[model samples]
Target: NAMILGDSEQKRRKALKKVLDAVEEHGGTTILSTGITGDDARIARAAVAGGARLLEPNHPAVALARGHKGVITMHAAEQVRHEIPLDEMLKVTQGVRNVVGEDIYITVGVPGGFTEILPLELKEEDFFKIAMSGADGVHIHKSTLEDLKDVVKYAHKYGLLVDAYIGHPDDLHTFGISARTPEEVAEAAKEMEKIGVDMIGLMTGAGEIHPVIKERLSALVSSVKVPTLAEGGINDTNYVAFKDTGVNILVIGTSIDNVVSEAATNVVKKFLSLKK
Candidate 1:
């Protein structure tokens, strides 16, 4: 007999399954079109125009986009600052939902930031805003496993799936992790999975995939039942290889940031070509 899942857990699982299904349908690699903020629906429309089924926008004022409230969300650990309000975050998410419609899988970053220098300082209320915004999931970066445990708990409470990021093997220490080998990376992925992370995002450096990165990516795929997402330095030249490494999702950032729809079209075209 099949085990039953709660309504909220079902929602979370269903949301991530869209990406996983697409990756499986595409023969092991699909792109998660990103580098846009929710405030501008045009960016969302453009990315979709290029053929993105999945989208993860920066959380408005927290990372990109101009906020009407004039709240500066980040600085050194010394200076305490006001984070973006729930209303503002909701407004942005609503805006994105309106343009993309319900069919597109949307994940908004909580305190979406450019640098990975600091651990995430988020609370349950922040997840509440993301949930209310009509997003299918929440994307988290630069957080420790302890923080991720709390995030997964709160996000699932609101029926939102969580996609957590793991940086390069050499840079793991920056995020309070120490994964320098495939085995260490596998252990870390397992720990994250145990904490209920629905998807594991692996970020490498720009310009060509490194040999070590591929190994760790494979390790992640082998170690966890959850989907593995790969980003950074991915393009037409190397996308096929990343797919070969068994990554489920490839995050397209800089290449599609400006061109928007057209970039999406090209990437989707290449992805479609790989299917057969």
Candidate 2:
């Protein structure tokens, strides 16, 4: 099972088809599907009808952060510019609610860059507040394990689901970290379980997913008792291959970023048909 996050309504359907085709060709499944922007309910229904087992409506924040995280994590802060206000974020959430109904599961990302920009006083608290407000879970970047532990503690206080972003191949062997190998991903899962994390988000690191590295990733998912999400370079062309490794979720961007509305819809249709 995987989750495809659509960048926009215009290209969302096309992206969906691409995912469906990849899934069908490789004999996989799509558990959840969502759009970066647009009518959430409509998109949710379309994704569900198109073969997605679950739906995530209106998650532009995650989409935006996907881009932002890619740039900031790889380079300097001067490269990217754009700040999404809380009001706009709420509006997107409302749209999602209108589309997916009230009981939908939603998650948000807290960019590492944002943590640096805002006052230190507000960093942890603000993230906690957002998590408590309505989001079912929170996504953290490759921050310190100690800091991450603090986040886990706070999230546990509120009974919020925790998911940490594991990119940067270098961090695999870093100390105080449990996510080392596929078995380590499971070990980290246990650590997170102790801290109360519902999922572990893994990435290919800087938008690159080589076939050679699939085994490492699959190991991580296989190691953990909790669900695992794959990020970076996930698309219709590559998803089926990734799915074959048994990833539980996929955090995708880029491929769905620049396409047209018709193309997007077609992509969704194609992916759905693949399930057949």
Candidate 3:
């Protein structure tokens, strides 16, 4: 009954207790897949229970709660066609912060395209405005990062770290890579790391389509100095496999949703196993 009742507030708290204990025993840190749909706050709570220190409040609950159609959670998925207005985003981010608290890291998705519903332009003003909105970090698309150099510079004062995507079959984040030679991928990562982002997301693999290769993923992770996040198609198996690649975190979504999803619970146990 605890498993099925995990949907209720009391049940989730109890289930949260089990995972919290498990993660505490092992002591470690740890997606949003449609297949894994947990609420932003609920998942954040459970993820912390599983020793996850960060969370992204891109779920619609954060958006819709503030009277928005939806927040843009899916950058690669076609469903997320636009962005939420900055005025509304402030409310969403603030509300989300209350849910996750300052202790749990929270980053909201940013516009890869200026044409989206956000601001007129993705300028220093826009970044600053968004940073002031209370997000710990911002995730940008790999193919169209605009000018993260100045972007991060202007917003760093606000205590927001810039996180950019690394691989897109569409290319562009390919900035310094040789463009061939799989190892060249590392070359690109080396440059991006030097470019000074708070974190790098190695996400060439399209979600639920073609997950990136472990070796290629490894090369990128090994090359970067800053926190490297393995995005797209994150799973328990890869969570273990990528840790060996020197990745700081496994970026998961599609499978980490409401009920605080059982798959996510299993992932917590798996990562906890690696806790020394």
Candidate 4:
């Protein structure tokens, strides 16, 4: 009986477990760099060199170059209907798997009813197409309560991890919920966990983390056993607030989009230093 046995341990998928191990190795927090459009291979290398444990590349080849270590989460964003082709999704997925060779964790985006997508949404067919991409997970954005459960089950059927979102406090009304608060959002997050989402994405919006945002995120982390990822507007300066809230992963974009390594190094250093 040399194996570990526990409800939490038993429930974690291999990819999620890999991420948790990296988090532990990095001393409690891991940085995910997103929004790299051009010159991605260099940006990817620089980000990892600067201590980023996760990479979110729009193009999978960038991930291929440097995704051997941590997680390579690619987003197939479709702002307009048919913006991203099915063939394109497969190529990226196949391209990444060929490079990373299936050991390193990978996840790709599956858009929901985002405001950006407005009036149109990715249907079950689209979800299946993404699942066929053969990545380790799916990152769902702006889905409804009912739709979230459906997509989670769909992803599970293909043995893919699901990362779902909890909207910002101000935008909760869009979810058809009234009188939203930190506790209310946490309850929603808990519901998502019950629906089998492997991880939760808490929207921090752009700029600094306000007092209420911190409270909401803290409630989310405490309410769910699964890992909580803070998405949107996290930088080196205000990321301390997100870490204090106990968010497992910090999704940084604009701050690290330019100088890449140095900006990532700044945030990663501070995130890791929190433990010591």
Candidate that would win on lDDT: 1
Model 3: per-residue Cα lDDT at residue 174: 40
lDDT of 3 by residue, 63-100 (tens): 43343444334333223334444555456666656665
Where is the poorest 10-residue window by lDDT in model 4? 73-82
TM-score of 2: 0.61
Q: Would you list the C-alpha lDDT of every candidate in the order shown?
A: 0.68, 0.49, 0.52, 0.61
Better of 3 and 4 by lDDT: 4
Candidate 4 residue pairs in backbone clash: none
What is the lDDT, from 0 to 100, of the residue 266 in candidate 4? 91
lDDT of 1 by residue, 12-77 (tens): 777877787777666767778776533468877876776677887654323434533443432221
C-alpha lDDT (0 to 100) for residue 170 of candidate 2: 69
> Candidate 2, which ten residues in sequence have the lowest lDDT sum?
1-10
- Comparing candidate 1 with candidate 3, which one achieves the higher lDDT? 1
Q: What is the lDDT of residue 55 in candidate 1?
A: 82
Candidate 2 deviant stretches above 4 angstroms = 1-82, 111-133, 169-189, 205-212, 260-276
Kindly list the per-residue Cα lDDT of model 4 for residues 1-276, writing each as its tens digit. Answer: 123334223333666776787678667877655666222545545555566555554333333334423334433222232243445545565565554444444566433423334455556666557656656666566446777777776666556677777875466324222226888878888888898888887877643578877887888888998878888767767887777777888877666654654677899999988973
Give the clash total for candidate 1: 1
- Model 4 ranges with Cα > 4 A deviation: 1-12, 37-42, 58-82, 111-129, 172-179, 206-208, 260-276
